[PDB]
Design an enzyme around this catalytic site. Structure first.
Site, short mmCIF file in Angstrom:
data_model
loop_
_atom_site.label_atom_id
_atom_site.label_comp_id
_atom_site.label_asym_id
_atom_site.label_seq_id
_atom_site.Cartn_x
_atom_site.Cartn_y
_atom_site.Cartn_z
N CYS A 79 0.86 -1.15 0.00
CA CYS A 79 0.00 0.00 0.00
C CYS A 79 0.93 1.25 0.00
O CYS A 79 2.10 1.23 -0.32
CB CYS A 79 -0.71 0.18 1.31
N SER A 100 -2.79 -4.03 2.37
CA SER A 100 -1.92 -5.24 2.10
C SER A 100 -2.25 -6.39 3.02
O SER A 100 -2.40 -7.51 2.57
CB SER A 100 -0.43 -4.87 2.33
O1 LIG Z 1 -2.63 2.05 2.55
C1 LIG Z 1 -2.94 1.74 3.67
O2 LIG Z 1 -4.05 0.99 3.94
C2 LIG Z 1 -2.03 2.07 4.91
O3 LIG Z 1 -1.47 1.15 5.52
N1 LIG Z 1 -1.90 3.38 5.22
C3 LIG Z 1 -1.43 3.95 6.36
C4 LIG Z 1 -1.28 3.25 7.57
C5 LIG Z 1 -0.72 3.89 8.68
C6 LIG Z 1 -0.54 3.24 9.90
C7 LIG Z 1 0.09 3.89 10.97
C8 LIG Z 1 0.59 5.18 10.81
C9 LIG Z 1 0.41 5.85 9.61
C10 LIG Z 1 -0.24 5.20 8.53
C11 LIG Z 1 -0.43 5.93 7.35
C12 LIG Z 1 -1.03 5.29 6.25
C13 LIG Z 1 -1.37 6.06 5.07
O4 LIG Z 1 -1.52 5.57 4.00
O5 LIG Z 1 -1.52 7.36 5.32
#
Ligand SMILES: O=C(O)C(=O)Nc1cc2ccccc2cc1C(=O)O
Length: 297
Positions: free
Chosen positions: A214, A221
């Site tokens: 992702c 993912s």
């Molecule tokens: O694409 C996703 O589902 C993903 O895991 N995203 C994310 C997961 C996160 C998890 C913890 C801290 C910041 C994050 C930030 C993202 C983001 O895309 O902004």
């Protein structure tokens, strides 16, 4: 059954509670390497790091660090690399990992722009006249062709090790309607996309592990891989009911944090495995139906 469980959870709307339990129980291992101040600019998010015990090391003497983990599902006998979306300075390290790790497949579940912000480098050639060359790890990548569907695009990329001039074919599956911190439009679309991946060979054990990403390499993912492994597991025994979706999640948990970011992803994953059970239990014609509902064309 998992379907009884779904309706237990649903009837007593306690997804959020379940999922907090999961967050509750998930493993915590050292990420000492990720946090070396030298690797600062290799990490896209302060709070999303690879455990050291399962991180992918680059075969470079300079700095073997990439934000990627090997998820190793021993009973399913399926393994995946999950990783963040490449930063502008790690596109070269990403492709070095695909090369050394001998992957056939790369699954992108994000867009480069989501919600106004830049989620990910444009790490692959959008057009075949215009290869990319990655100077730091000495690799060529060329678009060989693509197949654009409404909700996803499959690409044939050639990847070249400039040092030996040996050449590999990579397929790149880009799901483009899977919202950040969201779930897919339906179980049919996701299963149609998952089954395109499977069909392509890229999840098969004569290749190195599929690379899934992702933006952080965890929410979307985790959801992909959780559904895939549950279907794998039920397929091997033909036994839907020996499959504990939440146990599978915590098993993946040992190898990379925060896999599945939301309770609706949890719920979506159940939906996807319950639906896919149809196909796994001998109704191949479900797969047609998927393709149809998904409006792929
Ligand atoms: O694409 C996703 O589902 C993903 O895991 N995203 C994310 C997961 C996160 C998890 C913890 C801290 C910041 C994050 C930030 C993202 C983001 O895309 O902004």
């Amino acid at each position: 059954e998992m379907e009884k469980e779904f309706e237990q959870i649903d009837k007593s709307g306690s997804w959020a509670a379940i999922y907090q339990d999961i967050r509750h129980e998930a493993s915590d291992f050292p990420c000492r390497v990720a946090k070396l101040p030298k690797n600062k600019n290799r990490n896209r998010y302060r709070d999303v790091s690879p455990f050291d015990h399962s991180r992918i090391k680059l075969h470079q003497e300079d700095n073997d660090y990439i934000n990627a983990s090997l998820i190793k599902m021993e009973e399913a006998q399926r393994s995946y690399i999950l990783t963040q979306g490449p930063l502008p300075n790690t596109c070269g390290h990403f492709w070095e990992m695909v090369w050394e790790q001998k992957s056939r497949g790369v699954v992108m579940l994000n867009r480069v722009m989501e919600k106004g912000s830049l989620k990910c480098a444009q790490y692959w050639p959008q057009k075949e006249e215009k290869e990319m060359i990655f100077e730091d790890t000495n690799l060529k990548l060329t678009l060989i062709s693509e197949d654009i569907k409404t909700y996803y695009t499959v690409r044939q990329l050639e990847l070249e090790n400039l040092t030996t001039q040996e050449t590999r074919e990579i397929l790149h599956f880009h799901y483009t309607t899977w919202p950040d911190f969201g779930v897919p439009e339906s179980p049919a679309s996701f299963l149609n996309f998952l089954f395109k991946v499977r069909e392509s060979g890229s999840l098969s054990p004569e290749h190195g592990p599929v690379v899934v990403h992702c933006s952080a390499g965890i929410g979307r993912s985790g959801t992909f891989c959780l559904a895939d492994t549950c279907l794998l597991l039920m397929d091997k025994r033909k036994d839907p009911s020996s499959v504990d979706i939440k146990k599978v999640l915590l098993d993946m948990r040992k190898f990379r944090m925060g896999l599945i970011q939301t309770a609706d992803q949890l719920r979506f994953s159940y939906l996807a495995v319950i639906e896919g059970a149809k196909f796994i239990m001998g109704d191949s014609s479900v797969q047609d139906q998927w393709k149809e509902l998904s409006h792929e064309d």
